[PDB]
Amino acid sequence: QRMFEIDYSRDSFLKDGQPFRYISGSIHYSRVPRFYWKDRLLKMKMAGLNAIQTYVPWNFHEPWPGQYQFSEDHDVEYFLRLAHELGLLVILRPGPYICAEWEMGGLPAWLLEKESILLRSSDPDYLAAVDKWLGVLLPKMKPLLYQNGGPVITVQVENEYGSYFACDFDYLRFLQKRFRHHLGDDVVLFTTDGAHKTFLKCGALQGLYTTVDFGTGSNITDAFLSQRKCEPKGPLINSEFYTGWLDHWGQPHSTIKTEAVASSLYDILARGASVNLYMFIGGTNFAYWNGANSPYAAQPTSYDYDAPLSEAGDLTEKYFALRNIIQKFEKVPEGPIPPSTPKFAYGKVTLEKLKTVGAALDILCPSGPIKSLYPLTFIQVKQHYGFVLYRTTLPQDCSNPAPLSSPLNGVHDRAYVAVDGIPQGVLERNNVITLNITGKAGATLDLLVENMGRVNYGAYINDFKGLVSNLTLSSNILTDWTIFPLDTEDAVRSHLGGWGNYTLPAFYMGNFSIPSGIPDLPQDTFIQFPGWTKGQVWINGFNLGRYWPARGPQLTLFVPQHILMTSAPNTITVLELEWAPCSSDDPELCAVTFVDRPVIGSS
Amino acid sequence: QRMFEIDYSRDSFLKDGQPFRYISGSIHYSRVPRFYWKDRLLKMKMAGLNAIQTYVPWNFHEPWPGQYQFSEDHDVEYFLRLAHELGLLVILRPGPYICAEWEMGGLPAWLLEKESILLRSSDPDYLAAVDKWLGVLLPKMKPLLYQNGGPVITVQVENEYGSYFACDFDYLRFLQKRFRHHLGDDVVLFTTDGAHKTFLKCGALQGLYTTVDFGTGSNITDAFLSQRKCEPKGPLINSEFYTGWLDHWGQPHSTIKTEAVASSLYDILARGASVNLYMFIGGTNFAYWNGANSPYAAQPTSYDYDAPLSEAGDLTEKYFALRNIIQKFEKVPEGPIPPSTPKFAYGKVTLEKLKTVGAALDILCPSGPIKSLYPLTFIQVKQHYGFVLYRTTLPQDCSNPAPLSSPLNGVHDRAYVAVDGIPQGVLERNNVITLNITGKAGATLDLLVENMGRVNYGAYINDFKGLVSNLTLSSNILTDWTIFPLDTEDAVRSHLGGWGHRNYTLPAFYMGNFSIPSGIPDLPQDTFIQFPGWTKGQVWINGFNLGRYWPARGPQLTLFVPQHILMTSAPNTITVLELEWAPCSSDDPELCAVTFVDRPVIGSS
Numbered sequence A: 001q002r003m004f005e006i007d008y009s010r011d012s013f014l015k016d017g018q019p020f021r022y023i024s025g026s027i028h029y030s031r032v033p034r035f036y037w038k039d040r041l042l043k044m045k046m047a048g049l050n051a052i053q054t055y056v057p058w059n060f061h062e063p064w065p066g067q068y069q070f071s072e073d074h075d076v077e078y079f080l081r082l083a084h085e086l087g088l089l090v091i092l093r094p095g096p097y098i099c100a101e102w103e104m105g106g107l108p109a110w111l112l113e114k115e116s117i118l119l120r121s122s123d124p125d126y127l128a129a130v131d132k133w134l135g136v137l138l139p140k141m142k143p144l145l146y147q148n149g150g151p152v153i154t155v156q157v158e159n160e161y162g163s164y165f166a167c168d169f170d171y172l173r174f175l176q177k178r179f180r181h182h183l184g185d186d187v188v189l190f191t192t193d194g195a196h197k198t199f200l201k202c203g204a205l206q207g208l209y210t211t212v213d214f215g216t217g218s219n220i221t222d223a224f225l226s227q228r229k230c231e232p233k234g235p236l237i238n239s240e241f242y243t244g245w246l247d248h249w250g251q252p253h254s255t256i257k258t259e260a261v262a263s264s265l266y267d268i269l270a271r272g273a274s275v276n277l278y279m280f281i282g283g284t285n286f287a288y289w290n291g292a293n294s295p296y297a298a299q300p301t302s303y304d305y306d307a308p309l310s311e312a313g314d315l316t317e318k319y320f321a322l323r324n325i326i327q328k329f330e331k332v333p334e335g336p337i338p339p340s341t342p343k344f345a346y347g348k349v350t351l352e353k354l355k356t357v358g359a360a361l362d363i364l365c366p367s368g369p370i371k372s373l374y375p376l377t378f379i380q381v382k383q384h385y386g387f388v389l390y391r392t393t394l395p396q397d398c399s400n401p402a403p404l405s406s407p408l409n410g411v412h413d414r415a416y417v418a419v420d421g422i423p424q425g426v427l428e429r430n431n432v433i434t435l436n437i438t439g440k441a442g443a444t445l446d447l448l449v450e451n452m453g454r455v456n457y458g459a460y461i462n463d464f465k466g467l468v469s470n471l472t473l474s475s476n477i478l479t480d481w482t483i484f485p486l487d488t489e490d491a492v493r494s495h496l497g498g499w500g501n502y503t504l505p506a507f508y509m510g511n512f513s514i515p516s517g518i519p520d521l522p523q524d525t526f527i528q529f530p531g532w533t534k535g536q537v538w539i540n541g542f543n544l545g546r547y548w549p550a551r552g553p554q555l556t557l558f559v560p561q562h563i564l565m566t567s568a569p570n571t572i573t574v575l576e577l578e579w580a581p582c583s584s585d586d587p588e589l590c591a592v593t594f595v596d597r598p599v600i601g602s603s
Numbered sequence B: 001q002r003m004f005e006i007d008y009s010r011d012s013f014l015k016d017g018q019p020f021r022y023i024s025g026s027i028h029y030s031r032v033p034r035f036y037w038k039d040r041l042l043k044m045k046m047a048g049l050n051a052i053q054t055y056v057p058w059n060f061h062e063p064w065p066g067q068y069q070f071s072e073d074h075d076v077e078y079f080l081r082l083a084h085e086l087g088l089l090v091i092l093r094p095g096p097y098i099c100a101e102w103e104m105g106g107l108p109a110w111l112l113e114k115e116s117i118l119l120r121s122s123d124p125d126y127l128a129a130v131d132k133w134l135g136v137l138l139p140k141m142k143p144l145l146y147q148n149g150g151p152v153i154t155v156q157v158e159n160e161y162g163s164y165f166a167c168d169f170d171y172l173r174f175l176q177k178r179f180r181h182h183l184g185d186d187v188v189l190f191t192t193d194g195a196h197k198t199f200l201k202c203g204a205l206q207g208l209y210t211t212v213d214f215g216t217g218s219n220i221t222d223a224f225l226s227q228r229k230c231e232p233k234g235p236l237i238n239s240e241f242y243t244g245w246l247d248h249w250g251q252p253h254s255t256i257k258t259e260a261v262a263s264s265l266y267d268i269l270a271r272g273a274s275v276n277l278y279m280f281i282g283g284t285n286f287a288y289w290n291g292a293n294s295p296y297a298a299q300p301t302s303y304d305y306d307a308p309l310s311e312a313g314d315l316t317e318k319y320f321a322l323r324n325i326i327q328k329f330e331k332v333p334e335g336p337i338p339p340s341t342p343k344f345a346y347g348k349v350t351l352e353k354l355k356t357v358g359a360a361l362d363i364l365c366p367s368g369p370i371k372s373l374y375p376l377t378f379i380q381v382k383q384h385y386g387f388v389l390y391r392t393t394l395p396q397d398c399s400n401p402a403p404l405s406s407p408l409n410g411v412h413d414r415a416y417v418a419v420d421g422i423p424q425g426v427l428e429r430n431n432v433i434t435l436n437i438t439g440k441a442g443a444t445l446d447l448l449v450e451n452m453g454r455v456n457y458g459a460y461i462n463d464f465k466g467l468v469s470n471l472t473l474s475s476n477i478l479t480d481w482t483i484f485p486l487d488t489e490d491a492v493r494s495h496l497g498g499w500g501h502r503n504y505t506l507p508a509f510y511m512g513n514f515s516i517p518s519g520i521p522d523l524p525q526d527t528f529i530q531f532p533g534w535t536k537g538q539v540w541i542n543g544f545n546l547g548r549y550w551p552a553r554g555p556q557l558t559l560f561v562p563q564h565i566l567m568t569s570a571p572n573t574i575t576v577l578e579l580e581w582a583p584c585s586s587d588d589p590e591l592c593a594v595t596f597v598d599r600p601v602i603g604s605s
Ligand SMILES: CCCC/N=C1\SC[C@@H]2[C@H](O)[C@H](O)[C@@H](O)CN12
Pocket: A098, A099, A100, A101, A159, A160, A213, A240, A246, A457
């Protein structure tokens, strides 16, 4: 009965045999707690959007081969039924690579167990993994297709493949074939590339509808001329019309002026194109989900993206401006719009040192260490995210400062160094490849190595983390390593088994109570770390992401109220990696602050 | 052993043998929805108060004799446990008369079934009923007494008795005897009166600790000296230190400056005096609970009182300044203060007229009317609050306007008049006792009479309501009356029988529905409803009577709507009973509407 298709006559979509144009906003269910899905979707519907667009991050659902996460916050099918229920159509972007400022562009790290794998190509081991994944994901998506009573109207194949070096058309044909096998022959399949013949050359394929992306700085006539070169008939489509842009730690927060977004949007819409706003809400890279660009620069925890809905889902000026623009082409729904959530400043919460990482290896590594003559990568020791401790012992005496070095810039991505429990400093990928250490002969040399996010774009998406090449001490190669994978998540959640200048990396814990019986508490809040330097934060064992007040521009992290409790005290755990304000006699300096406003744009 | 006593040697209270003085705030549980009890008491705790004071309005708990309300919003026992769980002490004021700008000063209207009753006196019928109420309420309060493990440290007997004319000391001794009977010999019993010998004269009694009240305009030294005259030894106590004042419809909203309150509080506390702030939160007079003053002037729906916590419980600047003053004397609790609740503007909701009151008689009055030669009062027809319809026929032709009058000024308190379904205007207690009417001989004369609130202070608390004396037409007494007491609360919850039982316009019901989405964490929120183009009436949402609106007079324009009576997915039904003029006649539906705004307007122009 229900039909969605391209008609090449009036250069648009037909939905059930009538002209249709979509006005869509991106929302990534993996960046919004499920608790807030309906709030974010309804606020989108109230803006006049007739569709949403989302990415399926493969690594978010298949963290090990044959092990799947489809429940609760990982419940993509529920997210799509929710959008359908609210009268929203869906543009589905299942990858397998999605880019998206997300860890390894969505590709699982365990693909790198074949060290020579060519990602995003007809590499047969890559293809076999993708097919297995498609064979799990696509049967789930099939009943959600418009034609089968669901909201899914079009499906993107890959993501900006014309920007990748490999240019493997056999790979794209494999995807087309497999998508067609699981989804049937009616579903509209499409690609998205940069709006210029140089990008379309390797991205476009026969039988996949070619669409472009571009933001407020591109000539709109030209951008659409580049799409029409590939598709002379059918809908003009901008699949990613930038409402804002991404951040990197240590760089200024990106913003795009409302007026530019509204002007461009009106223009796109008036030509009768379908369009998706990237992002409409950005949300947050919780835990270790953020990505990175080459040359190595990680994106921060916040994925606010200067979107119309702020990271916490607030209604912004930009929100109402775009709504006003869409009102010129559609009647938007009636009624008042769900509000920006109330925010509460819980104030200062004092922390106490629980344990250094060194002192906690029993619980961080219950299996015992892996021993190896040379250093092993994260992939080889079977850890994907977080931190691995690399231990050796000095061979020569170092009373005088000896150079500890990764000659091949093989510290991926940052390493916190200690000799016999004296902090020595930091090795930084691309930036600091040498550091002067001291200690006795037979001293324990510790390098705590952080994966700061796998690169999500470009040639270097095969980003093994860890010590990926040798380290040398006074030009001599350090050998005889004792490598500890670290179950930081497990250990924080069990209060490190205790259930019932630099400083050494350590866990700091405190807590705070919220009164019950109060109809408006708990509320959303923002955590601040003044005096801290770099680390990871959990509240009630929930990993809220990374803090780095030392680099900016993000100083506060979003804390959604639903992980806060009133029946029992809430516990905050910080893993500070470089310097904690906690030696002081004054214990009041060893503390975090909850504030009612975000600071993601610090100078 | 748990003890709380007056230390007469040391001019002080002893709590478990230690010196104690209290810094209390008034909160009336009958004026805050239960949903928000814990919110207000925690805000009051976080202010630095170590006690709260509250009244028990008898009529709130015994609407008819031997028929009690002690559950939910009427659950005083629970309110007190909640104050105790928060570590607050409680100063209980159970009347039996409480004043409090509350209908009849808390006295049940049914006491008036004896027309000649002398209230607040040793009149034997008033005593019997008081005694019966104390036998119900006081045994419930006994285990909440500090000595028995609860929060209650002192208990007020009567309320400003010294201001009342009767000066019946036997009455006071009767109360003391019965309070002692149910509560025991250790409870601290006390009285409150104006800070001046002319009030303390009839208020004070041996055995009851004498305390005073006074506000920011009183001389603190003179006030405490009047107290010391009755009580030479023991703690100084201002039982009602006014942080603001009451309103009346038609008068500007009363405010008292934060500075004057702060500096008076400082000085009271510098004396080592115990003090209670009246009000700390004021809340709302829902339904028909408001009182009035003589000469007749009703207090409005809002009981904001310019309190440190606003009507809807907001922290105000006054709150912070008062918290700061207390901090100078006492350590105040640590941690963040629960916030002002989020308010939400639901916007315009259109209503439409469902039925005039005239057309809804059968559902409003299902047992039928009472027939009487001359008019009967609300009490005689067994209705205490709301509206009573009086009906007769014109005994003569009035094709030329003829005067309808209540020569003895006996329309209590407002009558909405119609002849054969044509509205004629309004009769008003004091202001307008005559109204010109037209109609044919034998036409139906209707007077919809509103009880605007029984006087809560003065000699005139025996306020019957209704047509309390005869009407004349062209000077001749009108006879043969058909009187319909109106069951408006029931009729509204059944949607005028629609849902079954599992210039002027005719008084009429207007209804309209609005939805709020489910699965949104922060919806529904508190709101405020406004009535642009409407005149005077009653409003319900989901059958919860939010009180009276009178935007024609002010100063209150909005009414407070607590979030917990609002529902998701299921439509919320607004019912408006407009009494004088509805904006609903033109061919513009969008005029027939109300608006929900996110800020209160109780203090305008
Ligand atoms: C020249 C920049 C091209 C890199 N592409 C980007 S950076 C921001 C966005 C998101 O990553 C999105 O997932 C990409 O499709 C397009 N894009």
